[PDB]
């Protein structure tokens, strides 16, 4: 108890915050910054162009899950919305191909585009500030060559595979200068869109706009953003001998180790632990260990689809939460 | 001047405030849960909870009952101010750790 989620053999306990006045007679844990400000802490573990891993420490589950939900569903990104097919003679149906192109994640940074207003006419909805236009023109022809009979299609034909990288950025209007230094390319250019045999062709253009992951999955900027509580393993009594090695085997490789000399098993790295509670099934360690998770220590893993960096996605999520709270604050309350 | 975002449900409202339900459109568990947590962190608030009455509608009904010290509207406004402050602290700490790295 007391900030620790209890991991039992048949249940999970103590999962609610209990950090408010009215939990106990001491009406403590009133909200105040300069207490939360001094207790809250961030520990960044790693940073890539596509993945981040950081620890929001001493924050409540509601706020951490608010950030996670905003990242997954409410942070805007850019994806193809409308596909215009000039010619499609492949076996892949037009709508199937259009859906796939929509699922291709574009390496265009949002805040370069404005939100599309859907109240405008169709002739007046898409502008050089609202839309990215990607074309795709592939015609498959037999390779004018003669390799081994019935070989792999990469050399029997030409353009036998249509990749996402074949999607070409077409500047419209003033995008020729706005996007000159950051041309729009797929985040994953080896995405296989379609396979076509000689005589088949795919000609199209696609309009890409800002969207919300709640509106459609294709707009989500994170290939997964989630967290997990920090595992906590408390070895109540010394474990020694071969029993210590069995205890060690109950966890993933690096989680616990055997001290040299003392031959006692100690918790070496609880972060690497997945809570399979394997140890909680042996009745040998039944009272020699307590499994738990720190309820307010969140290990965020944010892996981005590719349009923006994971730390940017997280900051945008915090800014989105703050903005919606502030919008509500400014709004008047109507009877 | 948005006049549709947050409404006060009068049938659910008491006399002299201190107990009121607010309807917040285009809101869901994201804002509802954080707001409820922050509002419960207020000593005068005796009751706070939200509900999305139906998944089909983008609507959130948040209920606040207080003791006599303040009205539900004041507790709501304080909750929104405190949520903004909390997110500001989170922003500062995260941007500082990004810069340090």
């Amino acid at each position: 108890m007391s900030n620790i989620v209890g991991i039992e053999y048949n249940r999970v306990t103590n999962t609610t915050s209990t950090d408010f006045p009215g939990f106990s007679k001491d009406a403590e844990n009133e909200w105040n910054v300069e207490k939360f400000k001094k207790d809250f802490e961030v520990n960044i573990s790693s940073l890539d162009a596509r993945e981040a891993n950081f620890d929001l420490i001493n924050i409540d589950t509601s706020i951490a899950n608010a950030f996670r939900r905003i990242m997954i569903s409410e942070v805007p990104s850019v994806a193809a919305e409308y596909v215009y097919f000039f010619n499609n003679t492949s076996v892949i149906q037009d709508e199937v191909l259009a859906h796939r192109i929509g699922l291709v994640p574009l390496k265009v940074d949002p805040d370069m585009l404005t939100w599309v207003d859907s109240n405008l006419p169709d002739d007046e909805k898409f502008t050089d500030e609202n839309t990215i236009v990607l074309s795709l023109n592939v015609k498959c022809t037999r390779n004018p060559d003669a390799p081994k009979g019935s070989t792999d299609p990469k050399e029997l034909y030409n353009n036998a595979h249509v990749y996402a990288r074949d999607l070409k950025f077409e500047p419209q209007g003033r995008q020729s200068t706005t996007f000159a230094d950051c041309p729009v390319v797929p985040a994953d250019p080896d995405i296989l869109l379609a396979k076509l045999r000689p005589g088949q062709e795919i000609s199209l253009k696609a309009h890409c706009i800002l969207g919300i992951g709640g509106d459609h999955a294709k707009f989500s900027p994170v290939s997964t953003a989630s967290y997990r509580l920090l595992p906590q393993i408390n070895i109540l009594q010394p474990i020694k001998g071969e029993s210590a090695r069995r205890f060690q085997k109950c966890f993933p490789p690096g989680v616990i180790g055997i001290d040299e000399g003392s031959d006692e098993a100690y918790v070496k790295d609880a972060r690497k632990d997945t809570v399979s509670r394997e140890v909680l099934r042996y009745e040998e360690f039944a009272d020699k260990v307590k499994l738990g998770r720190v309820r307010n220590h969140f290990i965020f893993n944010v892996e981005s689809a590719g349009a923006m960096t994971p730390e940017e996605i997280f900051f945008k999520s915090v800014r989105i939460l703050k903005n919606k709270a502030e919008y509500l604050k400014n709004c008047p309350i109507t009877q | 001047p948005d006049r549709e975002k947050i409404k006060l449900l009068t049938q659910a409202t008491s006399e002299d405030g201190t107990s009121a339900s607010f309807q917040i459109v285009e809101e869901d568990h994201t804002l509802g849960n954080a707001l409820r947590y922050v509002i419960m962190k207020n000593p005068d608030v005796e009751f706070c909870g939200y509900s999305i009455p139906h998944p089909s509608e983008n609507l959130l009904n948040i209920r606040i009952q207080t003791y006599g010290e303040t009205t539900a509207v004041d507790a709501l406004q304080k909750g929104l101010k405190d949520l903004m402050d909390l997110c500001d602290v989170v922003e500062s700490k995260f941007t500082e750790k990004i810069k340090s790295m």
């Binding site: 805040d111 960096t309 900051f315 945008k316 | 941007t95």
Partner: peptide, 17 residues
């Protein structure tokens, strides 16, 4: 990495349409 991309860029997508 280690860049405050959000401070450098003036966001536009994040504001409500």
């Amino acid at each position: 990495v280690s860049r405050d991309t959000w401070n450098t860029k003036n966001m536009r997508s994040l504001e409500p349409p």
